[PDB]
């Protein structure tokens, strides 16, 4: 394998000519896509990869300076696309990966035919002019709990992030991938995400964006989907689903996979 391919656990599955890239969010890995991948293998070559810092990656590769902003993750994405010789792709970004792909597409819009965002937000912190869902005190509480007992935090946080039954298979899976991260890496990354502010780059986006989220998402109020739709600088469309949870492609695939497939297969009018 190539050096980038190996470092990110890259897989290229399927036999189609066109490319689709599936990019996961915090606390999980490329297995979050397991219910979607089987539906894509004839139409596409499906590119899966893990973000640096996920529990499936080598913690020795986690450069704290490199990843102190989302730009470091966007470089990694562009490096993968370059090594794999992608001409263009549909990019499906979950949670923070929606903004990572957005940043990458501003540097190389030719590589992105469309961006599909799942559970995305350009900013979590409130202020008197913008509702993202969180106050600084909420973050301080979260980070204090993470740092004081990481194992206990994973078990309490997973059911909140996934939503629904606390004993579900999806809660099981997510609690395990959370706890497979090195605690200092997880803490550092979650701080970086929570304090991010991508609002000012949305107007520069030049690739069509499909904005999908659960109607009940603990980290993404529905008004954020409308905010993305308003401020993205080219055509976009919003679909709020009748689901609960931040990883709905994992916890409610019977509802969510058809929605993603629809946005993969149909385009927004120019």
Numbering used by the authors: 1 to 270
List passages from the publication reporting this PDB structure.
KAI2 proteins are plant α/β hydrolase receptors which perceive smoke-derived butenolide signals and endogenous, yet unidentified KAI2-ligands (KLs). Prior to their diversification, KAI2 underwent duplication resulting in KAI2A and KAI2B.
To elucidate the structural basis for the differential ligand selectivity between KAI2A and KAI2B, we determined the crystal structure of PsKAI2B at 1.6 Å resolution. The PsKAI2B structure shares the canonical α/β hydrolase fold and comprises base and lid domains. The helical lid domain (residues 124–195) is positioned between strands β6 and β7 and forms two parallel layers of V-shaped helices (αD1-4) that create a deep pocket area adjoining the conserved catalytic Ser-His-Asp triad site. Nonetheless, further structural comparative analyses have identified two residue alterations in positions 129 and 147 within the lid domain which appear to slightly alter the backbone atoms and generally distinguish legume KAI2 proteins from KAI2s in other species. PsKAI2B exhibits a structural arrangement that results in a larger volume of the hydrophobic pocket (125.4 A3) yet with a smaller entrance circumference (30.3 Å) than PsKAI2A (114.8 A3 and 33.6 Å, respectively). Further in silico docking experiments of (–)-GR24 with PsKAI2B resulted in a successful docking of the ligand that is completely buried in the pocket and positioned in a pre-hydrolysis orientation nearby the catalytic triad. Residue 160 is positioned at the entrance of the ligand-binding pocket in helix αD2, thus the substitution of leucine (L160 in KAI2A) to methionine (M160 in KAI2B) results in modifying the circumference of PsKAI2B pocket entrance. Residue 190 (S190 in PsKAI2A and L190 in PsKAI2B) is positioned in helix αD4 and represents a major structural arrangement at the back of the ligand envelope.
